Amino acid sequence: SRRDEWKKLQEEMTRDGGEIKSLETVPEQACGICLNFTDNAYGSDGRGSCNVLKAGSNISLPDVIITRSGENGYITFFNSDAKYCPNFERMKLIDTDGHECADPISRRVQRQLSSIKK
Amino acid sequence: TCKECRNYFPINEEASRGDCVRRISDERQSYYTARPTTEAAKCEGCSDYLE
Amino acid sequence: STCKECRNYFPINEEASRGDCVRRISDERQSYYTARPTTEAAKCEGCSDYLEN
Amino acid sequence: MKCTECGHEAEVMKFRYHYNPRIDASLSLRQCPECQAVVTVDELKREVLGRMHNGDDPWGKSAGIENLA
Amino acid sequence: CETVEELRENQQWWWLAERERSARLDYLRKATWKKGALGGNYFDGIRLDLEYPTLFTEAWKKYPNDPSMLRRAKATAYVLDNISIFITDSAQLVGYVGSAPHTIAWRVDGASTVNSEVYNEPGIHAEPEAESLKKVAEINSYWNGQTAVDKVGRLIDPEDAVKFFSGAIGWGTPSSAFGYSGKNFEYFMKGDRAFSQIIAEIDEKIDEAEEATIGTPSPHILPLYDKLNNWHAMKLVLEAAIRFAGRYARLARVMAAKETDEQRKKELLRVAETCERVPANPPRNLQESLQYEHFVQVLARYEAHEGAWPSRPDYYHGPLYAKDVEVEKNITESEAIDLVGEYMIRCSEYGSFSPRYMREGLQGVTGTFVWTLGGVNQDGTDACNGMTIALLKAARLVRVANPTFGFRWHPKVSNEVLRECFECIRQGLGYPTLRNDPVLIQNTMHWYGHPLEEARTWVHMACMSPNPTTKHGTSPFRMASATMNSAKTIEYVLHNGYDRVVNMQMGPKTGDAREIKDFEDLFERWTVQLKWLMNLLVRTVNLGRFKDPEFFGRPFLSAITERAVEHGIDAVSPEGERGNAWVTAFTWIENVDSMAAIKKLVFDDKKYTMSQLIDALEAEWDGYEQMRLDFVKNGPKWGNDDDYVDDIMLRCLSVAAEHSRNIQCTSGNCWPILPENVSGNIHYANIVGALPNGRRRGDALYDGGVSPGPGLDKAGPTAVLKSVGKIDHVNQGRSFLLNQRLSPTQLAGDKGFQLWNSYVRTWAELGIDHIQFNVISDKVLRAAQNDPEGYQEVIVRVAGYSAHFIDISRKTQDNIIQRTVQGLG
Amino acid sequence: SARLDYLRKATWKKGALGGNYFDGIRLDLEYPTLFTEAWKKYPNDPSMLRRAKATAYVLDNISIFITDSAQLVGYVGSAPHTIAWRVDGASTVNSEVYNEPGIHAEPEAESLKKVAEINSYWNGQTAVDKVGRLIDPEDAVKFFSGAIGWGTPSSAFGYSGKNFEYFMKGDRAFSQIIAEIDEKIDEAEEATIGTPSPHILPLYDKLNNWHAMKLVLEAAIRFAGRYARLARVMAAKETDEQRKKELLRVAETCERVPANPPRNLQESLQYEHFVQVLARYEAHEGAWPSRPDYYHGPLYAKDVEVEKNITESEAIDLVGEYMIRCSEYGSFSPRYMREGTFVWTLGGVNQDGTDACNGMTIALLKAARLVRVANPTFGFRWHPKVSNEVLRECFECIRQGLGYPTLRNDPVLIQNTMHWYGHPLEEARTWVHMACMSPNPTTKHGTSPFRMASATMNSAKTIEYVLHNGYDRVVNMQMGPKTGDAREIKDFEDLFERWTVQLKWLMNLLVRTVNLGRFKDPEFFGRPFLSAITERAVEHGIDAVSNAWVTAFTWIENVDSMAAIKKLVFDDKKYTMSQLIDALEAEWDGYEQMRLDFVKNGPKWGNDDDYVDDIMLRCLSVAAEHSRNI
Ligand SMILES: O=C(O)/C=C/C(=O)O
Ligand code: SF4
Ligand code: SF4
Ligand code: SF4
Ligand SMILES: [Fe+3]
DSSP: OHHHHHHHHHHHHHHOOOHHGGGGGSSEEEEEEEEEEEEOOOSSSSBBBEEEEEESSSSSSOOBOOOOOOOEEEBBBBTTTTTTTTTTOBOOOBBOOOOOOOOOOTTTSSSGGGGGOO | OOOOOOOOOSSTTTTTTTEOOOOOOEEEEEEEEEEESSSSSOSSSSSSSOO | BBGGGBHHHHHHHSSOOOOEEEEEEESSOOOEEEEEESSSSSSSSSSOOOEEE | OOOSSSSOOOOTTEEEEEEOOSSSOOOOEEOTTTTTEEEEEEEEEEEEEEEOOOOOOOOOOOOSSOOOO | OOOOHHHTTTTTHHHHHHHHHHHHHHHHTTTTOOOOTTTTTEEETEOOOOOHHHHHHHHHOOOHHHHHHHHOOOOHHHHHHHOEEEEETTTTTTOOOOSSSEEEEOOSSOOOHHHHHHHTTTTTTSSHHHHHHHHHHHHHHHHHOOOHHHHHHHSHHHHHHHHHTTTTSSSOOOOOSSSOEEEEEEEESSSSOOOOHHHHHHHHHHHHHHHHHHHSSSSSGGHHHHHHHHHHHHHHHHHHHHHHHHHHHHHHHHHHOOOHHHHHHHHHHHHHHHHHHHSOOOOOHHHHHHHHHHHHHHHHHSSOOOOEEEEEHHSSSHHHHIIOOOOOOOOHHHHHHHHHHHHHHOOOOOOOOOOHHHHHHHHHHSBBBEEEEOOOOOOSSOOOOHHHHHHHHHHHHOOOEEEEEEEEEEOOOHHHHHHHHHHHHHOOOOOEEEEHHHHHHHHHHHOOOOOHHHTEEESSSSSOOOEEEETTTTOSSSSOOEEEHHHHHHHHHTTEEEEETTTESSSOOOOSSSOSSSHHHHHHHHHHHHHHHHHHHHHHHHHHHHHHHHHTHHHHHTTTSSHHHHOOOTTTTTTTTTOOOOEETEEEHHHHHHHHHIIIIIIOOSSHHHHHHHHHTTTTTOOOOOHHHHHHHHHHOTTSSSSSHHHHHHHHEEEEEEEHHHSOOTOOOOOOOOOOOOTTTTTTTTOOOOOSOOOOOSSSHHHOSSSTTTOOSSSSSHHHHHHHSSSOTTTOOOOOOOOOOOOOOHHHSSSSSHHHHHHHHHHHHHOOOOOBBBOOOOHHHHHHHHHTSOTTTTTOOSSSEEEEETTTTTHHHHHHSSSOOOOOO | HHHHHHHHHOOOOOOOTTTOSSSSSSEEOOOHHHHHHHHOOSSSSSSHHHHHHHHHHHHHHEEEETTTTOSSSSSSSSTTTTEEEOSOOOOHHHHHHHHHOOOOOHHHHHHHHHHHHHHHHHTTHHHHHHHHHHHHHHHHHHTTSSSOOOOOSSSSSSOOOHHHHHHHSSSHHHHHHHHHHHHHHHHHHHHTOOOOOTTTTHHHHHHHHHHHHHHHHHHHHHHHHHHHHHHHHHHHHHOOOHHHHHHHHHHHHHTTTSSSOOHHHHHHHHHHHHHHHHHTTTTTTOOOOHHHHHHHHHHHHIIIIIISOEEEEEEHHHHHHHHHHHHHHOOOHHHHHHHOOOOOEOOOOOOSSHHHHHOHHHHHHHHHHHHHHHHHHEEEEEOTTOHHHHHHHHHHHTTTTTOOOOOOOOOHHHHHHHIIIIOOHHHSSEEEEEEEEEEEEEEEOOOEEEEEEOEEEEHHHHHHHTTTTTTEEETTTSOOOOOTTTTTTOOHHHHHHHHHHHHHHHHHHHHHHHHHHHHHHHHSSSSHHHTTTOOHHHHHHHOOOOOOOOOEEHHHHHHHHHHIIIIIIIIIIIIIIIHHHHHHHHTTTTTTHHHHHHTTTSTTTTTTHHHHHHHHHHHHHHHHHHHHHO
16 A cells, blocks of 8 residues: 555654754754755745655664665754664764855754854 | 453454443443443543443 | 824824835835734834824 | 864765755855854865855856856 | 036946835835835835724624625725724825734634744734734634635645645635735726616616516526625625725815815815716716726735736826827826826835735835736727827836836837837836737637637737737636645655655655656656645645635625626636636756756766665755756756757747646636746745756756756857747747846946847747846845945846835845846857 | 333333423434534535435444343434434424433533534524525515424425335345445546536536435444444343354344345344334424335245244234334424324235235234334225234234224225326335325335425414514514405405415415425435435435425414404404404403303304305315415
């Protein structure tokens, strides 16, 4: 059933509600500053994908579920907390400049990340 | 909680989830009733709990 | 006091209570006039543009 | 390669690739991972030559009648 | 210093135009806050409007039970009643979408992602940043979830929703919230119908409907109730519009009281009388007509985003301009030029918050605003008049980048009009963009089966696509939101339908690459990928258009269209409308150029195996720079009059056109493809990886829809014309953007017009529908790059629209500078 | 039998005596609470999908019970003594639930607090509220004022027809319907990922409808599984061997049906009772269309007479307990509507049309005789060649005074259905009693999915409006059209014209309201389960409910007044035209002699007087043509 898989992916994309309330600050270790984070290009809402983690991973809970074998990447947002992710790595080059067109790999244009010096 | 109660019953050996069974005798008829219960739920204000 | 005594208030009619608060704003690029509905009975309260008479 | 501003001595992949206006030529814009300075690179022989300022035009044009390389 | 004579001799046009224009025009031109996006960020002084979202949310909460369109009508009526309205110091035309000149409007229920981007956007919030962000978050919390785009995403197949909004293959939003719409100018802009007349018609329809619904019960009256609500909504919003105009009039009179200058007092009184006349009653002079049209557009932009400006100013303001300036000389020619230039300035001032793909895809402009000039009447005679000359002169004087001109060229165009259009081009405005009118008429007739008379009235919808303004011809929805990244097809053929950008398997598994036996297999794979992409985008946009009346609702647009007023339907409903739907194809050339490179170096040369090519593409030409140069130079390129690539281009267009005829829109019409890029060649510059045509990820894609790549063409402009002429514009596609650049030195002096006219005759004889020109020196653009201190009026034509140079992103600037400087002769 | 006696004695009657419930009956609060929570959970779902999810949540979390000697299970409510409440039926119904005395639990303060909170949530979001808002505001205020009449224009109340041929032949059960729905869903998914076209655009919301249709059946199967688990638990507790066997058989029955087609008579009866119960968890369903002797026919004949699987007396025992389970159902109804009756059809003819009567007709008659329930009254369909023994049993049953069977002349009813419906002849044979005077076939296309509640018309306020120029003293409002002052008239024919122009408006008001409700109810009030069990809805993926006739109340007193006015005032001239108006404005106060005269010589209906019958025939004939026009 591909329908269930794509429904799960869509529900993970629509991470709205309390999480929208959470946008005030970014944690010390965030997905948005991880090297393995690829920012979304459709909008600057902070959604993205993970190059390493796959499919139904989960890093929010202390007992993280890590599934590195799969077809589709893991949907993470720029403010998700990375203190429980085994594969987190602070990216060495953070281009906070928002006056240039989107670079999903290495550009972070969110307001909260504007003050995150390397 | 529920686990120690007389009327709580697990759906399957491996299922934490049970169905609560209450034996009730009304003016005209006595009958059984069931309602789901999670078995981890606090008895709290439960008047029908039995040892 | 209220919007009645403010110099920036202009009633739409000589009898009507409702009016327009009209203010002159100056920007670094341009100066203009802005109009905004007001009931003329609302207190000034925290109004930084209020100017009596 | 050897960054001009700082002797970082990284690999060609490590420098961040910006863009190349002249698709037929071999010269583009890359950013040093250490000093973050934008410099001009020669992809053909893989070394950095000079930093890139706003007014400079290193590429030129391979066609047209006005500003050829 | 910088004397007019010196400026003409040294070829400066921005400072010359600054010197030439009058004091009022100069003040109104320097009083505009630029609403374009530098990359993804707005101008520093720009602020987000909180008045409109707060008022709209407050009014929207008051009627939970009302239908979508009636509820939106009530909400926008409340906003128009309570929004701040302003008049600039020296303005004769009033109207604005927002609460202050330095402020952009926010589409609250456009999308939840857009609201999140609003919260995340830096520098657009007021001085109490904590308080402003708190208010924005309070708005978002209510408006998160019940948004129309969210409903569309929850309705379509989940795979389509995930892939479409992934930002890799689509450049559109399937709702009326963002996009544009067609205006039925034949209904409300013919001198006999204004808002009061439309209200009278709506009242008659409401009366007959209520009489039907109060008497004998029969099933025919069953669908009437919804119609009644629709009619009420339309009437309500129309009334609000009149009240809105009344507000301005009152303010004008108040200003007239304060002013101690007799001339300014007289002008303010004239503005008050104008706002009292329009939009309630049909215009009687030029100023009233301009105010009527501007009011209609401003109300439409209060209704929704409206990222395009469809209008034909010389055809509908032409009669009143002729009556005023020429027939009876009410106003001098100078005052007419002043009015037209300030009307264009008022057009430019519009600004609204748009998604990141729109913001980056439209560098320096809120949207693409194209005004149609010239053309023919419904009878077929020349429709050009003195209003066209006035518009061209005003555009030259003001030097406003965003409102561009599309001139419908036909063989009997008077020579003076051609000379004025060439003068506008030579100044560096980038417009008017000449369009071959007869072939475009034939294209509309062939694709959508429009009658000839209806087809003759077409105006540009956003950038290139013709669209008639008649009762049935006009289209009320941006069906072109099924934009496609064409390079994705060939990139998915070479990566087995896997996209690294979104870390997701996007395309169908057409088969493993690295083992393509012959060119036929590769072309079949590409055909499969192209059909998949077209089907996905068209299905998504079709469902968006189908469900828009329920999800979004449009009271004003339905109020100003004959179809909706007559039948009581929503405007975007396909009940009585011809489809007029097309697909835009970004970066189309990349596919055929990669085809040519592969077909030459792999199969017909055996210079490289497919394995080496795929490995180099995976490594992104790292360590294969010599291989990349071989693929660039040896591989034949489009635009050199070489049959090797041109036949591949024709085959690709043929299969695309066949698929377009196969698929159908909501109205059952076709879906022709339109190659064009705008600034999407820069938005997607990091979304498309390396390709066999020699591109590397992060490089800019090709400038235009069917124009040669940067420096790839070598034979000259004539070869480009011949290559583009092989395309059957009537049959192969909807339209083809042909960007070009001309040397300012050649076009200077007496003989520049003769060379341009010879090129135009060559372009017209080959049947090429569209041509664009860019006339600006490289030295000026380099100086503007070094310091933007003085070059605030330097304009460059990007793709289908013009923008100020110091406003677009640095990558776009460097790419536009790189374009070939063709030499006429 | 002893079990039948115990089950009959153990029922809490849901009928209303004198227009009120019995003391023991209570309002169920668990069902509205669970439904409201589930409704709150999903705001974005369409109406039918949201209702399906809410009903699934309720069925998962509702309290279920098995009586001490019960052989069949399934109840609409959390306890045998409680009553069902249609929480989102009508705001008037909710307010009347709040007002109604005697059906609230011992913590009356807390119970009324919960009821008030529920009403507060559902106030302004009800289907009838949506119908009233869509109609013109003046019409809404007139209709819901209560002066003209009382009506509920929505699918939450009304009569539902069941596609028995679809799911009760024995070929199909809920699993087979789920399989067919899965086939339709897979085909639609294949279409929606194919070639773009306007044809596939309707299929999306159709997919949602199919999803709701599947969800409700899955929920129903889980519900039966819950009952089976309870049966197994009770078997574990109990010691008596016979009750052990009965409980194990109940568990097996709940496991077999409604998931799979029944194999024996008990499974058939339980499957049908489950279908009915799940139907009544969806809306009010004021009728019981089912016929037992036909669709259970083959299974009972196989079990009892073909192979002697079960003893003969056990068949009558099971049928009696089935009718007992039928009687236990009840839902709250508005006081005006509470003043219907579950009617079955027996005998009849087959699809071909030859002697559908079988041994289970005799079984049903005997079970009704010994059980003596009042509400499940079944009329018999008499063909010219009914067996003599069946009629002997029917006459013996009518002798006991049960009030049934009410023999129906089958051929003339068949011809009536043939004439005004135009159904195929074979389809017309297989019809059941849907409404008090309406038959409806049970085939695929023949079956009517849903009929409206038949709103009530006050046939007396129109005369008062005529003589008061459209103004009622009861409510200070102008409702009827102002035709003219009653003081100036010419003849009783002119008075008839004024009365007719009043009555046409009065009737058109109700007809328009009910028609708009019927048109809009797919969006206002979805019906997932009803759509699930109808072949048309499953095949086309549409809501099942996609003519309206209104009952007349107090029409006889008005014709009495008309006869008195036509004869006394004009024909006999005893009183002038103004005096009656002056007496009516004072409500006959101080005019006792004139009131007594006006009622005395003013002939009452039933005198067998041609002059009175004249006005009766005129008043009914004029309305009959208007009803025909509508
Ligand atoms: O909506 C678009 O992308 C294009 C429109 C046009 O070319 O008119
Ligand atoms: S922190 Fe973990 S989940 Fe997040 S982007 Fe980095 S590797 Fe992926
Ligand atoms: S009686 Fe109370 S404690 Fe015992 S099983 Fe039931 S709910 Fe749990
Ligand atoms: S400035 Fe303030 S007090 Fe004065 S009129 Fe305006 S709102 Fe009222
Ligand atoms: Fe460096």
